[PDB]
Amino acid sequence: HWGYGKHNGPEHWHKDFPIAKGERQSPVDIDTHTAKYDPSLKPLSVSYDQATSLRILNNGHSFKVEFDDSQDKAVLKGGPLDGTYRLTQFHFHWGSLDGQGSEHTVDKKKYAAELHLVHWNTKYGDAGKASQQPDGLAVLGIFLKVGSAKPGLQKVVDVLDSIKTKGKSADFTNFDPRGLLPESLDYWTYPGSLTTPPLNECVTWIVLKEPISVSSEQVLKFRKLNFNGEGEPEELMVDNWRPAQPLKNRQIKASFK
Numbered sequence: 519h520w521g522y523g524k525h526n527g528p529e530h531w532h533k534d535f536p537i538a539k540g541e542r543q544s545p546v547d548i549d550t551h552t553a554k555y556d557p558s559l560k561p562l563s564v565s566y567d568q569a570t571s572l573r574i575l576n577n578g579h580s581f582k583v584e585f586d587d588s589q590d591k592a593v594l595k596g597g598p599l600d601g602t603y604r605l606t607q608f609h610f611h612w613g614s615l616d617g618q619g620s621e622h623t624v625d626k627k628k629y630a631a632e633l634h635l636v637h638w639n640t641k642y643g644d645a646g647k648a649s650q651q652p653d654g655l656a657v658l659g660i661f662l663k664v665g666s667a668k669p670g671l672q673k674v675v676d677v678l679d680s681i682k683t684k685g686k687s688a689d690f691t692n693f694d695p696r697g698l699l700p701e702s703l704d705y706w707t708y709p710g711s712l713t714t715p716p717l718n719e720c721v722t723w724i725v726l727k728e729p730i731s732v733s734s735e736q737v738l739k740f741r742k743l744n745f746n747g748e749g750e751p752e753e754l755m756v757d758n759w760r761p762a763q764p765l766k767n768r769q770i771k772a773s774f775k
């Protein structure tokens with residue numbers, strides 16, 4: 519199966535998922551000087567007031583916090599988007615060291631981690647259907663740098679010892695994702711893809727300019743997770759990021775400047 523290692527990592531994925539060499543793959547490097555300010559772009563509307571987190575899983579690739587998306591409770595709209603996108607889950611990608619871990623890069627700079635809040639367009643009724651559409655998903659990406667702790671992340675990190683190995687899950691209620699957001703909602707946006715198999719080209723990416731700060735203690739807890747299932751040789755879950763892919767025939771638009 520696919521993963522993040524030498525024999526099954528990103529450079530191999532195209533064998534099982536030919537779309538890996540497609541025209542709108544993610545992530546990308548965001549050239550800040552080349553991104554076009556678009557005064558037509560709207561402020562992003564993040565309405566996470568009624569979010570209902572349900573569970574947290576270690577799936578052997580990352581961990582994901584999944585939400586109740588059976589009614590508009592936590593929705594994204596505006597920005598570059600037409601229509602309403604419901605939040606289904608968030609997850610992170612991170613590195614073995616603080617100088618790598620993000621999927622997107624900014625003028626080639628890598629961040630220590632990247633948070634993805636995954637939303638699906640309600641016009642398609644369910645996330646599976648939405649993933650088959652070019653405007654099906656909107657992923658809000660937030661960079662993490664290491665410095666001051668993020669208090670709103672602490673409830674996540676403190677639960678990770680309970681899901682150390684692949685397949686372990688736990689109930690995870692009343693987590694408020696508003697505590698993961700930076701002050702500014704200035705963003706870059708472009709059409710792209712899932713960053714893991716099946717790599718579907720179904721995502722409107724919205725990448726915030728302003729990172730959040732997390733502490734070294736917080737990211738050390740991410741790096742204590744394991745890729746392996748219990749009983750298998752121990753492999754620390756680190757460097758679960760896809761590198762930047764060719765921009766091809768895309769422009770990155772900026773909501774600011």
Ligand SMILES: NS(=O)(=O)c1c(F)c(F)c(SCCO)c(F)c1NC1CCCCCCC1
Nearest residue numbers: 579580582609634636657711712713714716
């Ligand atoms: N990274 S991402 O935000 O483009 C992303 C989606 F938008 C998705 F909608 C999904 S779910 C559809 C794939 O089966 C996804 F897995 C990822 N990637 C996964 C990261 C790899 C580790 C698995 C944990 C799930 C998220």
Ligand SMILES: [Zn+2]
Nearest residue numbers: 609611634713
């Ligand atoms: Zn992701």
